[PDB]
Structure formats: C-alpha cells, structure tokens
Amino acid sequence: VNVPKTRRTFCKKCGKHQPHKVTQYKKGKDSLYAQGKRRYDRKQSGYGGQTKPIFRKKAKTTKKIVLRLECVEPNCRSKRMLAIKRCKHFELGGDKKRKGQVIQ
Template sequence: VNIPKTCQTFCKKCGKPSATERQGKASLCAQGKRCYDTRATITKKIVLRFECFEPSCSSRRMLAIERGKRFELGRDEKDGIK
C-alpha cells in the first residue's frame, strides 16, 4: 500500500485538523530492534526459595543464582562430578 508521507489529521492539542507527518522507516540498529531480535536463551535462571526453620517465623525469600542447564539439589561437594 502506498501512503503519502504527509496527510491532514485531527490534532487534539490544536483542536483542528493539521498536517501531520508519518514516521520514517525503522532503523535496524536501534536498541529496541536489537533487543527484539535476540535469540531466546535455552537456559533458565535457577531460583532458590528459602524458608525460615523457626516455628514463630515463617518468612520466605527467593534467591536467583546463575543460569544452568542442569541443577541438582542436595549433592555434596566431595562427591565430584561423574
């Protein structure tokens, strides 16, 4: 569709129809375009949910640690990775 660059449309601020210009072609190197075109990450951020052991306190908090494909809970350091 071929649309002219300028046209007459109603302006709320002026309260009358006035000449308005359409936006130009979007740049390929704008920040929003770069963010939009990035590939999705395969790995998810690992979020740990901590809960207080005290019977009077039932507070919970979340802690995000680094990204990873694999996550094992409760493994000792001395076991090593096999």
C-alpha cells in the first residue's frame, strides 16, 4: 500500500484533529536487563541445554504495518501507534497515481 507522510487525525493530549507526520514503527533493541531476559539468562546459565522453546514453524509471510505518529505542534510532541491491515507492499508518500493517462 501507499500512505502519505502527513495525516491530520485526532491527538490524545490536544483533544482535537491536528496534522501528524507519518512514518513506520520499528522494533527496538531488546534490553539485556529486562525482567524476562534476566530470568531467561539465569535459567539458560549452567547445564541442562536449551530450557525454553524456540519457534521454528514460520507460517505467515506478512506483518501488521504500524505507523508512528508525530504531533507537529511545537509544544505537543505526542506519539501514538496506529494499526493497518496486513500487506506485503508498503511505502511512504510515493507515486500518487492519476486516473487514466497514457502509460508505456
């Protein structure tokens, strides 16, 4: 799908529609000192081999695309997540199409 880099939508902190800068959400780095990671590392330490299951049966080939909103107001700077139905194609503000021109 194609989505624009700007979108005027509702803001949680402001309480009304304001324009928002639009980009895709990315998974951050896993913290080494998280509670489950510290629990996993202490459990994985010592003998016994792999203690927790490892997922291998990868079935689906797509992801739910998430937009990372951005309040353009200089004093708001509110961020929130927005979900869109799954699609293999994704791009930001590209090739706004016409309606029936001469293609080649």
